[PDB]
């Protein structure tokens, strides 16, 4: 039960923002910007690939992702290097994996270039999904009041 007041959220997402330990399941190209079914089908496909590679002794890449006013950033855990950066305005839909409480994904990109990024969180995925919800709503609210710049 975390405090989700505006002032708290602002401090939470400013700068580097919130960091979470996880593993990259994969990135899939999808035909639309949103859709529960669209994301679940994509998640199932990406996991299918992961399972096939695991049978061959492969493992998912260890990463840490951050949620900040800069959107979602994925860093390689071993080196700390930024590998993927999806700005808030490029993220169109967030979806939890109804078959896995430790996985979620998001659709990013403009029209004609939608991609579903699938993540396997170290801990439960819920707090991450909720941070994204709070981040987006906060940015919407600040922009409406025209105070985004004064807070980011």
């Amino acid at each position: 039960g975390q405090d989700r007041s505006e002032a708290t959220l602002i401090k939470r997402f400013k700068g580097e923002g919130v960091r979470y330990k996880a593993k990259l399941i994969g990135i899939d190209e999808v035909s639309a910007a949103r859709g529960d079914k669209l994301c679940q089908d994509s998640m199932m496909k990406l996991k299918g690939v992961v399972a096939g590679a695991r049978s061959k002794g492969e493992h998912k890449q260890k990463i840490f992702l951050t949620i900040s006013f800069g959107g979602i950033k994925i860093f390689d855990e071993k080196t700390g290097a930024l590998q993927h950066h999806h700005a808030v305005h490029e993220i169109s839909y967030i979806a939890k994996d109804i078959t896995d409480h430790r996985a979620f994904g998001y659709v990013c990109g403009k029209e004609g270039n939608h991609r579903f990024v699938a993540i396997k969180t170290a801990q439960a995925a819920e707090p991450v999904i909720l941070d994204l919800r709070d981040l987006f709503q906060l940015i919407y609210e600040l922009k409406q009041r025209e105070e985004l710049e004064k807070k980011a």
């Binding site: 305005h89 169109s92 839909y93 967030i94 403009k110 922009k143």
Partner: peptide, 10 residues
């Protein structure tokens, strides 16, 4: 599951 209110389809 939710849509991002500040997404720009452009």
């Amino acid at each position: 599951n939710f849509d991002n209110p500040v997404y720009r389809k452009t």
